Design a binder for this molecule. Structure first.
Ligand SMILES: CC(=O)N[C@@H]1[C@@H](O)[C@H](O[C@@H]2O[C@H](CO)[C@@H](O[C@@H]3O[C@H](CO)[C@@H](O[C@@H]4O[C@H](CO)[C@@H](O[C@@H]5O[C@H](CO)[C@@H](O)[C@H](O)[C@H]5NC(C)=O)[C@H](O)[C@H]4NC(C)=O)[C@H](O)[C@H]3NC(C)=O)[C@H](O)[C@H]2NC(C)=O)[C@@H](CO)O[C@H]1O
Length: 129
């Protein structure tokens, strides 16, 4: 899919991301145009060799099973292709918990710099919800 700004965003409040886990819904959206630029089809491997998966850009080394990753902990325990599909009904569960392991958004690197100290609340604006 190719999501536009509003139409790729209202879904968090649909998946329980609004005001969720101490992170208000909006802190979350700005990274989205910093992670896949509203595309769940954007993916790469890395200089670490782990491959990434979805708009989410998740690495096959610590989180899931693409199988080319040995020693991949894969705590999620679900096929990586389960995210990349434009339909996002289930894709958020693992992305939900990743902040509960105690680092929060420290999992997410861009958000620490491209949305931190920046007004993210400005990003989630303009959409009725
Ligand atoms: C193109 C694009 O989309 N943007 C790019 C992006 O592609 C670039 O690639 C990055 O790829 C990596 C893998 O290929 C993506 O995944 C990162 O990997 C990070 C590696 O440092 C990872 O950091 C670790 O996260 C751990 C969570 O599993 C944290 O664990 C803590 O471990 C302690 C010691 O390790 C332990 O004793 C604690 O119990 C434990 N606590 C928790 C809360 O787990 C830990 O915070 C951290 N390690 C350190 C340094 O302490 C990230 O968590 C992981 N992200 C996710 C969400 O999986 C990465 O997502 C990709 N980048 C981006 C931006 O997302 C990237 C290259 O920098 O550039 C982007 O622009």
């Amino acid at each position: 899919k190719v999501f536009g700004r509003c139409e790729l965003a209202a879904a968090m409040k649909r998946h329980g991301l609004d005001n969720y886990r101490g992170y208000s819904l909006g802190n979350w959206v700005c990274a989205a145009k910093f992670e896949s630029n509203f595309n769940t089809q954007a993916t790469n491997r890395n200089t670490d060799g782990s491959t990434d998966y979805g708009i989410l850009q998740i690495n096959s080394r610590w989180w899931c099973n693409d199988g080319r990753t040995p020693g991949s902990r894969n705590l999620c325990n679900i096929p990586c292709s389960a995210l990349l599909s434009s339909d996002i009904t289930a894709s958020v569960n693992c992305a939900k918990k990743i902040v509960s392991d105690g680092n929060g958004m420290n999992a997410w690197v861009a958000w620490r710099n491209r949305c931190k100290g920046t007004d993210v609340q400005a990003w989630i604006r303009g959409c009725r919800l």
